[PDB]
Each structure stands twice: as C-alpha cells, then as structure tokens.
C-alpha cells in the first residue's frame, strides 16, 4: 500500500514468542521479499527512529549535475588542418552514456522522464603565454537528425528558430533547461528492439530517447595564436520520474551504443567473478585479530 | 524561485515522499 | 535601482545546486504522463528487495556457482558451513546486491538487514542449520557454541525452503560509515555464520550435495546518507563509439 | 536554573551587615564555585547594567571563518615533476587542527555539532610577467576514505554523485555549506579511544569526526608558462551546539594527529611554567611608580 | 528584469559575514540531536567557573608548585604574604584561568571578579589573613595598614577552608580594554594583596608551612567585547602530520 | 535570508541567550 | 517582470490561445 | 523604483499631461 515515508520506521518493543501456528520463515519462490520484522525475529526494544530518507529520493539521487560531454578543440586558424578536426566548433549528439557514473545511475531504471538542466563550462589554454581571451561561444540546440553547421561561420548559426545560447568564458557557466522532450511519456533507458521498420537498424538505440544536439562554436574570429578550448557539458536531470529498477551494471562498459560486456580480467567485476575472491566460504575477509 | 514562464524550468522537486515498496517486495496476489 | 552586493559563491557552479534555469524551448508542451508500472520515488524501495548474495566468492566457483553455497552431509557435529562478512559498504558477498550497490552510492547507513536463505536440495533432503549473527567486537566465531551466543535462527529445511535471519541494527552510532577501513568501530557490522545444527541427511537417490541460495535485503528502518560516486563502476578511457557522438 | 540572559546582571544596593548565622566564605571542596555576591561582600550601589552578552555567545564565538587549509602548488606541465608534487591538483582531508587559532577555539569543547561553511580563496602568481589567467578550479567534496582522483584529468572529476564546485579566480571566493555530517549527534573534538576493533588503531582520531575531503584541481589545461596557485580554505562553523568545556591548550601544539605537548623552552607556556615568571609572589609585575 | 547596481563591498569575503550559502549535499538529514550533558550556549558560563590562579609564577616553583602559595609562621606582625596583578587581559597569575583565557579572546571587559582562596594546611593549623583589593591609582600597597584602606575580607582559616574576595567592578569606564599597556587608566584594575592578619599558628606535628590555592572566576555582571585572536596560542610552522592531510 | 531548500544552509543562529551556568558553577546536589 | 515605464518593453505575450481557423478553412457564406 | 533617501534621486516623471496652450495661443483678455 502506497504511503508517505519521510523517516525510517520505528521499532516496537517485543517479548518472548512460543506459538504453535503462524510464523522468520517465508516463501522465496513466490518472488516476494521476506516480510519478517525484527520484532518477530529477536526480542526488541522501542526505538523512535528519526532518520530521514530524503537523500535516497530518486529526485535527489539523480539530480546531480554530471559530466556528459568533454570536448577539447583547437581555437586557431584552420586553413590547413585535417578534415577530422573540430575547426573552431564541434557538434555533440547529447547522450547520457559516455561517462559511466551518470550512465550507471540512469541505467538503474528502465524508464526515466526528466527535464535536462544543461550546464556548459568552458576552459581555455594557450598553445609562450600572452593571456587568456574572454571568448564568446555559441551553443546551439539542434534536434536529433536535424541540420547542424558544417563550418564555424556557417549560416546555420543564425538561429532563426534553433535555440542558441551565447556565453563568455569569464562569465558563469552557461545554463539551460532542456525539457522532457520524448515523443513517449518516458525515455527508454533500455530499448529492447529496433527503431526502424527494416531489419538493419541499430539494436538498443531509440532516437526518441536522444535529447538532441549541442553544436558549440567559438563566435570569435581566430586569434593570431592558437588556443585549446575545452568545453565540458553537465547535465542535471530534474523533475524526475523513474520506473522499473534494474540490476546495476557490474561489468565495465565497453561502448556507448550498447550494453556489451567483457568484464575485468580478474575479480572483482570479471565475467565469471563479480565479487573479489576469498579463500573459502568459511574464510572471513577482514577478521578481527585478537 | 522561478521567474520563467515554463514549468519545466523550475528547480528540482525533492518533495515526493510517497513510497510503495510492496510493488517490488510483495508483488504477489494472495 | 536595487543596491546589491555579490556574496562569496557568486558565479560558482556547484553540481548539487537547486535553481530554476532558462527554458531552451519556450511553450514546449511535454508528452502527457502515462501510467507506467513500477515507479520508484525513493531508492530505499529498491534496497528492500532481496537479492542474491555471492557467498561463494571463491576461486573455482565460476560465474553462477558463486551464487549458491553447496552443503554436504558431514560426519562431525556442530560444523561450520560458511560465513558472510557484513559491511555492505565494502566488497564481499553483499556488494553486488540491491542493498549493496545502492548503499555504495552512499557513505552512511543505518537500519536492519534481513538475510533469507533458500534451501535448494531435494524434497527428501532434511536437516537443521543455525544461522548466527554475531555483533562486532572480536574475531568471527568458528565453533557453533560460540556463535549461537549471538543472534541466531535455527532452521529445519525439511518442509521449509526458506528462513530469514534478521541482522538487527545494533550500533553505537546512529549510522555506520564507510571510510575504507573494514575494522573500524564505525564500520564493522559483525558476522553471519552458518553451522550444521543437525546434519544434511539425504536418501540414496537424492543428490548428496545440496545448495543454499542466500538473499539480503534491507528492512524499512534502513537509511542512507552522504551521497558519493560509486566505486563499482569506473573508466580510464572514453567508451567505444563515444567519439561518434561528435561526428 | 536555566534562564535567558541578554545583559549582564544588575547590582542591587546593599547596607551594613552584622549577623550571627548565615554567611564570603564558601566550600571549594564541593567543586562548586563561590556564590558570594558583591552585595554580600561590600556595600554596593544600584547599577542598572545594560552590557550585552551576545558577543560571547558560542555561535558568535565560533562562527568566525577561519583558515583551515592553505595549499600552494605549481600550475604548469607536470610531465617531468616528482611523484610527491601536486600535479595541478591537490586533495585535502578536512581537519580543524592544522591552524592553531581555530584549533584551540574548537578544543575549548568536548563535543561540537556544527554545519561547516566552506569558503575557498584562490590566488595565483606567475612563476617575466604576462598577466594572471582567470582559471577555473574544481573543488570536489569526497567522503572520508572514498576515492579521490589521482591525476588532473582523472575520470573521478566527472562528479556523477560527488558534489563539485567550479569557480574562477576572478569570481568571489567559492562558498559551500557542508552540513553537520557526523554519524553521532556531535563531533568528538577529543576522542579518548581507538576507532577500530584491533589494538593497532590511531589514538585520539575518530574518523566519524572527519568532515571529508576537498579535492581541488585546476580545470584548465596547463599554460605554456608555470603558475603558483595558492588555495586557501576557510571554515565557518555555524548552527553550533557546544558541550562540556575544557581547559584551553596552554602548551604549543606539536602535531595535528594528537594532543602531544612539549611546551616552550622558557616561561610563558613552558612544560613546568605556563605563566611568565616574576621575581617573588610579593613582586608586582607592573607596579605604578610614583 | 530587475535594475540593480553593485555596492562597495560586493564580492568581498568578510570572515565575519553572516549569510546563507549553498548546501553541498541536498536532502542530507543530519543525525538526530541527542541530549549531551554540559551544553554551553554562551562563553560567560565558562568564565564564571573558578579556576586556579598561578600566583606562584616564580622561578624554582616548578609546574604544580606554581598553583599554590606556601605560607609560613612569621615572627613579625602585619606581614605581606603575596600580591596578585589584576589585569585579566595580560600575562600573570590570572592568564591561565577560565576567566583569563576566554577574556584574552576579547579586548574589552567589564564586571566583578571573585577570588576564592582555599587554605590547605592541617586541621590544627589556625590563623587569620586579610585579603585586600586596592582600586588603581598609585603603587601596590606593601604594608597592611595601607592595603586595608581598600576593599578587604578578613579570613580566619581555623574551621574555614575558603573565603571569597569579591573584586568589585570599580572603573570609570563601562569597560576596561587591553591595549598592551598595563599602566593605562583604561586597563589597570588595581591590586590584590594578602597579609598576615594574625599569624599562621600550627602545632609541632602539623607541617609548619601551609599552602593556599587561589581561584578566580567572573561574576554574572561580567561582559566581554571586541573579539580578537588569542595571544596564548600561535604557530610559526605547520604542525606535524599536517602535510599528511594532503596525502 | 535563505533561498536554499536545506535548513543547514541558513546563516548562523546568533539568537540563543539561554544560559545555565549553574551546571558548571553549582554542580552540587544540596 | 517589467520595471520599465513603457508597456512595449515587457516580455513576450505567449498567452493568446484564441483561434479562428474557419476564417481560412471555411471562408464561405452558406 | 527608488531606494535612495532623496526625492530628486528618482527616475524621470513622465506623467504630467496637464496642458494650458491657451496661455500661448490665446493670451488675450476679451
Ligand atoms: C584500499 C584499501 O584499503 N585496500 C585495498 C584492498 O581493498 C585491495 O584488495 C582488493 O579490493 C577490491 C575492492 O573491491 C572493489 C571496491 O573498491 O569496492 C569492488 C569495486 O566494484 C571495484 N570497482 C570497479 C570499477 O571495478 C573496485 C576496483 O576494482 C578497485 O578499486 C581497483 O583497485 O574494487 C577487491 O575486493 C579485490 O578483489 C581485492 O583484492 C588491495 C589489492 O589486493 O589493495 C588495497 O589497497
Ligand atoms: C609587548 C609589550 O608591551 N611588552 C613585552 C613584554 O610583555 C615582554 O615580557 C614578556 O611578556 C610575555 C607575555 O606573555 C604572553 C602574552 O603576550 O600574553 C603569554 C602568551 O600566552 C604567550 N603566547 C604564546 C603563544 O606562547 C605570549 C608569547 O610568548 C609572546 O607574545 C612572545 O613574544 O606571551 C611573558 O609574560 C614573558 O614572560 C615576559 O617576559 C618583553 C620581553 O621580556 O617584551 C616586551 O616587548
């Protein structure tokens, strides 16, 4: 029965039981957890328990601002740079899967509905030193699959209808709230299927669950010297509803595209040994020596 | 405090203390 | 206008701050909330679900063999079968449990634990075990007459596939803390041991070795404080295809 | 009897006493302080005493922001530096014992319950001069014993669940309130025992009373020149409850790990002479010459 | 938005400011307050507890010998035994007292002091002392007939192990201040002297030299203003193991 | 003034003028 | 919120949900 | 809005719509 819980439950005092009838012995096979109370197992005292439960609220457990993107690029003249390089601008398809602390926390659930509070920290380093330029950056939110700019002075940066944020390095970090955007009532943290009508689509990736694109340029023309500009994107989920909890990820993540697994070479978190080994089942690992 | 016109813009809602752990601990019928 | 002054902490980005921020999409109407089964509002709901202990965290126990304890017929009395270390903040048989993994996002914890053991021999397999919780202080008890002086349940698994050993919250402090020190008086919960109370006694056509699956959950007096990064996941590189998000 | 005291007490006028019965002579041996009033000792006047007592409130006496940590490190390229050096980042186990003004004030009590308001001042000096970079720093709060980062670009700085504050040198100082965190209802300022079940643990140190860790990096990649970056951490206790007052520390502190004592070589505050010497007990040290 | 302007003092960190600041741990529930004995809400509670004066702050008085004044039988009358300097803000017999150490966190002070002397001879030891407080102005009185013109108590320590000399607050100003000038009219409290009122008269099997332990407390008319760093502790280095907090 | 959701975040509480010095000056029973 | 004296200075007015699509979809008379 | 103690410190007073143009257009007596 659903109830409001702000503190952990009190313990009632209990006495000696010696009864022939009603049971510390439950039924595992029903899939139910043991409802055996400590009052029924040992002889207890009354404890008025004032321990709050608010820090394990799913809103508090997930509304931590976590690093989701970290991109360095050269801020310089890119007349003669490679066609792979971020030429004063990068684009980033927003995902929660590239950094494993946020990834494992969000993958504790099957479905998540949250607004995405996006914080953008920019740091700059000179590639001799003459000082750091207070550069203006543009972060433009582009939807999944939509047109992203192809150069720094692209006419896609005009943002007639795309939301752009302009921000300076000397400023506080740029901060935007992206709404809950999904075409569904929740994001699918795990998607058991293909999101395409042919059989060649990607498994596990529903583009409904992709927030969108951060297209981040430097608005400034290049300086006579080069700079390395590191953009860090932080996401805080908020107004979070979470559904269907899952086993946590035990093995190391291999990719962001899937739930592929290798494990570590030895215990802990190996394919065939998640917990580190002890010598025997009757060996106590941190036995007090007296 | 929220001076934005969208309700999703607001701060986090750390106020929902409703629990129903019995849907995971007792998902049985009898 | 308004005379103001900036405080210390102006312009900082605390990752745990709680403020309204600018809507990137004005007048966006989110998709209507649909009822989805299994909503979690508080992580203590997950932590109260019993999940398999890896008591057989030994070498040669490979994969799924680690989630059961094989008990055999013995020819000496009062014999120790297995023991379980009890610090849920540490690595051990409790770590990859629902109570263990959520607790290791936290530093401080209070509250009783329940241990449920399911006997998985045959119907014809009979026997009695004693499951002892020893509050901390000294070494782990190795004989039965030493361990039954603590909290124990005696379990006939004749018709009864399961019992619960409540590990009651017996601590000096309101919380126990992780500090990477297993032997600390602020950390150590004590011990769970299992002994042959009688003997595993099977007939000739039952399998002579039987298995126990152990579970652990938290009770509803359980609490977790001081949220920290989990030591259970980590990276020293970028993952595969993470660069493809920039392309 | 407990009472609200906002001003010092008034003096009532008194007259000549010549009484055979009730007593200026008390009982020291009971451990009680003399309750002899000035009305009973001399012949007094009425004084309406309007002197406030608010500055000796324990909240005011202890909610001063005091220097608790002061760490300089080189902000430079650390490819070829020693393995002892802070390589663009330091960690600090939060203590109140490294700086003796705050230490002696907090060690005036046996038990303290306070929230810790943490203020972080960062100063930078060039190691020729080209200007000072407005650097971004990360201060990440890590619990006692938990994992702290091992390099500057560690993936532990992503802060999926650790609280981090990002702050710039040009900004006002970073300021966070750390709550009262102890597993007990108060911190033990003094801990007469071992906080471990074996006999090899540290005496006097209860890790329950350790606030946590400040892991402070520079978020910026290194510049072509080197900088010395001094981080000063300030702690203001607040919402303070104090229990069981103690004798103040008289001898100089030797260590932060214990209450070990040496004294100074001569009076004052020597092992065998806390107060500076005078010639005799009938020698007045600052006698008015007329 | 709101038209604002920054005042002088914007962005400053005053170490005595009083502001709310950002919670590093949201929804942290602190450990429940338990009643602990001996709560102090105001430092004047400590300052009213009598504590030992180090009146014997001389050389050859080693350690604990400094906390008692040995009185002997004398063969001249009206003789001076000891004197006490009275500025609680300075170094002297009052400094390492509970009233002295807390006051030296402050600059300004008002209010009466009490001096309690415990006679620690034998039961058979008899005698009368006169404990004189002299308000400031001139030199410390050296003869008994000069000192008894001020505030005094005459104490027979025959059956009476203790008396109290109230040093009443007699000052021109509301407060007395420390300025590192002992002879200042804003600082100097005057003198406490002790004289043989009769003689320490012991029998042959009592110890012929007897000790006095002197105490000082503040009364409840006592006040302290202007909080400063204490001159009683200091450092010119980092302490031992302080570097280990960075490792 | 406090716009944070945690009560420990607030400014210092310099308002508790309750004293009981008799628990240190008269801890006697008669 | 608007502290300017001109009403055109205010933020955008995203509150007009009146529709009359029939002036474009049914501009007929019978 | 004015948080200064002097009334001359305030913003401009663009609210006086009283006109008497007849003192310039009809300064005649009959
Ligand atoms: C730090 C200390 O006081 N003692 C160290 C010993 O604990 C260590 O022995 C190994 O400890 C391992 C601990 O298990 C975890 C953990 O920290 O909880 C389990 C985590 O899931 C795992 N995390 C990931 C992402 O895989 C974590 C990780 O492997 C380690 O932090 C990597 O160093 O380990 C485990 O039980 C091992 O089986 C056990 O041998 C010894 C090394 O023998 O070093 C001590 O410093
Ligand atoms: C400054 C002045 O006007 N006169 C100086 C004399 O006072 C000084 O004579 C010495 O004074 C010493 C003062 O005692 C304290 C103090 O300042 O109150 C006692 C403190 O507890 C002590 N602090 C610590 C951390 O140990 C402090 C400290 O030792 C001094 O500040 C260090 O200089 O001293 C004390 O009574 C001495 O016994 C007395 O000789 C003379 C030197 O003879 O110098 C004058 O400038």
């Amino acid at each position: 029965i659903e109830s409001i819980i702000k503190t952990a439950t009190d313990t009632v005092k209990s006495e000696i039981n010696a009864e022939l009838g009603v049971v510390s012995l439950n039924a595992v096979e029903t899939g139910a957890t043991s409802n055996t109370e400590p009052e029924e197992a040992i002889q207890t005292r009354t404890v008025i328990n004032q321990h709050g439960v608010s820090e394990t609220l799913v809103e508090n457990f997930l509304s931590r601002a976590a690093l989701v993107s970290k991109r360095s690029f050269e801020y310089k003249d890119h007349t003669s740079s490679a066609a792979q390089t971020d030429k004063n601008f990068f684009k980033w398809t927003i995902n929660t899967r590239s950094f494993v602390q946020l990834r494992r926390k969000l993958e504790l659930f099957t479905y998540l509905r949250f607004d995405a509070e996006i914080t953008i920290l920019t740091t700059v380093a000179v590639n001799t030193y003459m000082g750091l330029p207070n550069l203006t950056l543009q972060a433009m939110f582009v939807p999944t699959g939509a047109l992203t700019p192809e150069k720094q002075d692209s006419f896609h940066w005009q943002s007639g209808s795309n939301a752009s944020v302009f921000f300076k390095i000397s400023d506080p970090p740029a901060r935007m709230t992206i709404p809950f955007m999904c075409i569904n009532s929740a994001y699918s943290v795990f998607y058991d299927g293909f999101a395409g009508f042919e059989k060649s689509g990607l498994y596990g990736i529903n583009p409904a669950d992709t927030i969108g694109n951060l297209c981040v340029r430097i608005v400034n023309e290049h300086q006579p010297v080069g700079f390395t500009v590191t953009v860090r994107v932080y996401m805080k989920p908020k107004h979070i509803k979470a559904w269907a909890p899952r086993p946590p990820r035990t093995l190391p993540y291999m990719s962001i595209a899937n739930a592929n697994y290798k494990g570590k070479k030895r215990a802990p978190n190996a394919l065939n040994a998640i917990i580190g080994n002890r010598d025997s089942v009757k060996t106590m690992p941190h036995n007090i020596v007296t | 405090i929220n001076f934005y016109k969208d309700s999703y813009a607001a701060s986090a809602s750390k106020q929902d203390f409703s629990q129903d752990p019995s849907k995971f601990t007792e998902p049985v019928v009898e | 206008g308004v005379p103001t002054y900036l405080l210390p902490g102006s312009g900082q980005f605390l990752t745990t701050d709680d403020h309204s921020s600018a809507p990137v999409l004005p007048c966006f109407n989110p998709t209507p909330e649909m009822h989805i089964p299994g909503q979690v509002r508080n992580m203590l709901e997950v932590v109260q679900v019993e999940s398999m202990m890896e008591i057989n965290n030994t070498e040669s126990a490979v994969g799924m063999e680690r989630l059961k304890v094989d008990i055999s017929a013995l020819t000496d009395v009062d014999q120790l079968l297995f023991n379980i270390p009890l610090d849920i903040q540490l690595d051990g048989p409790l770590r990859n449990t629902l109570v263990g993994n959520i607790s290791r996002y936290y530093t401080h914890w209070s509250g009783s634990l329940e241990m449920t053991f399911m006997f998985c021999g045959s119907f014809m397999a009979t026997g009695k075990l004693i499951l002892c919780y020893t509050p901390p202080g000294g070494s782990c008890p190795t004989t039965r007459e030493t361990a039954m002086l603590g909290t124990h349940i005696v379990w006939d698994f004749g018709l009864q596939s399961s019992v619960t050993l409540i590990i009651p919250w017996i601590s000096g402090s309101h919380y126990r803390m992780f500090n990477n020190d297993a032997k600390s008086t602020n950390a150590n919960v004590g011990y769970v041991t299992c002994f042959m109370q009688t003997n595993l006694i099977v007939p000739s056509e039952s399998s002579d070795t039987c298995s126990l699956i152990g579970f652990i959950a938290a009770k509803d007096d359980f609490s977790l404080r001081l949220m920290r990064d989990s030591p259970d996941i980590g990276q020293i590189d970028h993952l595969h295809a993470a660069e493809a998000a920039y392309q």
Side-chain angles (χ1 to χ4, degrees), chain A residues 84-99:
Chain A
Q84 298 295 319
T85 66
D86 286 328
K87 295 180 181 182
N88 305 117
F89 79 106
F90 69 96
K91 62 184 76 176
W92 177 59
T93 306
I94 303 164
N95 55 20
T96 62
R97 293 180 182 177
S98 295
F99 290 90

Side-chain angles (χ1 to χ4, degrees), chain C residues 166-206:
Chain C
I166 291 292
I167 299 164
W169 182 249
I170 301 173
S171 183
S173 297
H174 284 270
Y175 294 88
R176 275 167 181 149
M177 54 176 281
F178 175 77
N179 56 349
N180 219 36
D181 190 5
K183 300 184 178 179
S184 177
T185 59
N186 295 317
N188 199 358
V189 193
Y191 309 101
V192 165
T193 56
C194 184
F195 289 85
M196 283 293 181
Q197 188 72 279
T198 58
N199 193 7
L200 177 64
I201 296 165
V202 306
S204 299
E205 292 179 355
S206 291

Side-chain angles (χ1 to χ4, degrees), chain C:
Chain C
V2 179
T4 59
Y5 60 96
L6 294 178
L7 293 181
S10 180
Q12 78 187 2
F13 168 49
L14 180 66
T15 62
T16 59
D17 62 348
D18 187 83
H19 298 283
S20 64
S21 60
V24 74
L25 299 176
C27 295
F28 189 84
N29 303 114
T31 295
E33 292 178 353
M34 187 181 74
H35 184 271
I36 299 168
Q39 188 185 1
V40 179
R41 278 77 61 98
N42 189 333
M43 298 307 294
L44 294 175
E45 300 166 0
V46 177
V47 101
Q48 298 172 13
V49 178
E50 62 190 8
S51 61
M52 288 188 276
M53 301 184 284
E54 178 165 339
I55 305 166
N56 197 6
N57 53 348
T58 64
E59 292 180 351
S60 68
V62 172
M64 187 164 293
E65 293 170 351
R66 305 172 69 83
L67 295 176
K68 65 180 176 67
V69 178
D70 285 337
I71 61 170
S72 301
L74 295 170
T75 61
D76 296 329
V77 297
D78 317 340
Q79 292 299 113
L80 180 63
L81 299 175
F82 60 91
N83 59 13
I84 301 165
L86 290 185
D87 198 359
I88 58 167
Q89 294 294 332
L90 296 175
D91 179 66
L94 308 185
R95 174 182 67 81
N96 195 13
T97 60
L98 293 167
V99 66
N101 289 120
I102 302 303
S103 298
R104 287 161 58 87
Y105 284 96
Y106 290 91
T107 314
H108 296 174
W109 67 279
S110 181
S112 299
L113 301 171
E114 69 90 27
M115 279 188 177
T116 302
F117 292 91
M118 177 170 62
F119 179 73
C120 298
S122 70
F123 184 84
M124 293 290 112
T126 64
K128 289 185 185 180
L129 302 182
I130 180 172
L131 289 158
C132 302
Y133 164 67
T134 302
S139 63
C140 183
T142 59
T143 70
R144 187 183 71 188
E145 68 268 16
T146 290
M148 48 59 53
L149 301 173
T151 295
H152 65 271
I153 179 66
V154 178
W155 167 39
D156 182 70
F157 51 81
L159 197 143
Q160 278 73 28
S161 66
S162 299
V163 282
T164 301
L165 177 62
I166 291 292
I167 299 164
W169 182 249
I170 301 173
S171 183
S173 297
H174 284 270
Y175 294 88
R176 275 167 181 149
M177 54 176 281
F178 175 77
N179 56 349
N180 219 36
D181 190 5
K183 300 184 178 179
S184 177
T185 59
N186 295 317
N188 199 358
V189 193
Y191 309 101
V192 165
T193 56
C194 184
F195 289 85
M196 283 293 181
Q197 188 72 279
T198 58
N199 193 7
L200 177 64
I201 296 165
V202 306
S204 299
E205 292 179 355
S206 291
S207 175
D208 58 352
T209 300
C210 301
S211 295
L212 294 177
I213 302 169
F215 293 164
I216 189 165
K219 297 305 293 177
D220 55 357
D221 60 348
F222 193 83
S223 180
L224 291 169
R225 303 191 304 172
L226 213 183
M227 187 172 173
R228 67 189 177 101
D229 56 347
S230 180
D232 291 333
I233 204 67
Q235 59 182 347
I236 56 173
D237 287 325
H238 295 91
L239 301 178
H240 183 80
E243 178 64 32
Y246 294 94
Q247 300 294 315

Side-chain angles (χ1 to χ4, degrees), chain A residues 93-111:
Chain A
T93 306
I94 303 164
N95 55 20
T96 62
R97 293 180 182 177
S98 295
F99 290 90
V100 303
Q101 288 306 126
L102 183 61
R103 184 178 183 173
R104 187 178 187 263
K105 289 169 74 180
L106 298 181
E107 289 179 356
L108 288 177
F109 298 100
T110 305
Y111 298 113

Side-chain angles (χ1 to χ4, degrees), chain A residues 17 27 40 53 91 104 113 117 120 124 130 141 159-160 250 252:
Chain A
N17 196 4
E40 296 168 346
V53 303
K91 62 184 76 176
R104 187 178 187 263
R113 183 191 178 95
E117 176 169 346
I120 299 168
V124 59
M130 313 302 288
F141 183 70
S159 292
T250 64

